[PDB]
């Protein structure tokens, strides 16, 4: 299983931190709200990092 294909994971913590995830249905890295802990791998600090790791998944 490709972690780039997993839906974005906010997790249990209560921050509102903007991260990027690869959205395979759109073919784009997109923003989402990360709560600050227990990140899964489809969670990047920049669009460039997301594109490098997941572009084309």
């Amino acid at each position: 299983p490709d972690f780039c294909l997993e839906p974005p994971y906010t997790g249990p913590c209560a921050a509102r931190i903007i991260r990027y995830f690869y959205n395979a249905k759109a073919g784009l890295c997109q923003t989402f709200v990360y709560g600050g802990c227990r990140a899964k791998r489809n969670n990047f600090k920049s669009a460039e990092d997301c594109m490098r790791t997941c572009g084309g998944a």
Binding site: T10, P12, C13, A14, A15, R16, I17, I18, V33, G35, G36, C37, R38
Partner: protein
């Protein structure tokens, strides 16, 4: 904050916003140079915003002060969430006034059933997303450790407590982390984690500040 109310401008003068180009966490001012927040709110380049009500507009009471140190508890565990506390030093001292004021640390821990005030600029919806302009407030009780452990088996450490309503509808939510839980004028909790927001049987979990008072005072004095 889900199920709360508009606090009113500058009625919670110890509440700060942590900003990284946008609001991402809260915090509590404990003296003119130091803020308490959550360890999972750590970022480089934090700007602390004091005196805020509407976080999207400049209204006249604000002070914007960079963090000069953002010190995560040395035993913070990013998997169990134990020791979820951070101290932020302000690069210059805040000017204290009626709208920017410190909150006292506890002298003892609070008991189950104590009513507290929880505040923040986090999401106000339990299903969906709405972020407020102005600061929101919630009155909620501390819950027993037994009930907190029953809600979250295997997950509650001695440095955590639950607060809220088991029927659902009232809770902290994303964007509230790091902010205050104040009980009888003392900072007893830091917004930390939960399971969704305001769901039945899933109360919020808060860092138990009374366990950290010695560490807070010594760390501040050593930095």
């Amino acid at each position: 904050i889900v199920g709360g109310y508009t606090c009113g401008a500058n009625t919670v003068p110890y509440q700060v916003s942590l900003n990284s180009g946008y609001h991402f966490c809260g915090g509590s001012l404990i003296n003119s140079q130091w803020v308490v927040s959550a360890a999972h709110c750590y970022k480089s380049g934090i700007q602390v915003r004091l005196g805020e009500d509407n976080i999207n507009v400049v209204e006249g009471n604000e002070q914007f002060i960079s963090a000069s140190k953002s010190i995560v508890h040395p035993s913070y565990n990013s998997n169990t969430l134990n020791n979820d506390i951070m101290l932020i030093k302000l690069k210059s001292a805040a000017s204290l006034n009626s709208r920017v004021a410190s909150i006292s640390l506890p002298t003892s821990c609070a008991s189950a059933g104590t009513q507290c005030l929880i505040s923040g600029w986090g999401n106000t919806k339990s299903s969906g997303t709405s972020y407020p302009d102005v600061l929101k407030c919630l009155k909620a009780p501390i819950l027993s450790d037994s009930s907190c452990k029953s809600a979250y088996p295997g997950q509650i450490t001695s440095n955590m407590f639950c607060a809220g309503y088991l029927e659902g509808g009232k809770d902290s939510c994303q964007g509230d982390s790091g902010g205050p839980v104040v009980c009888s004028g003392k900072l007893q909790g830091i917004v930390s984690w939960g399971s969704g927001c305001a769901q039945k049987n899933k109360p919020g979990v808060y860092t138990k500040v009374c366990n950290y008072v010695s560490w807070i005072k010594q760390t501040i004095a050593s930095n």
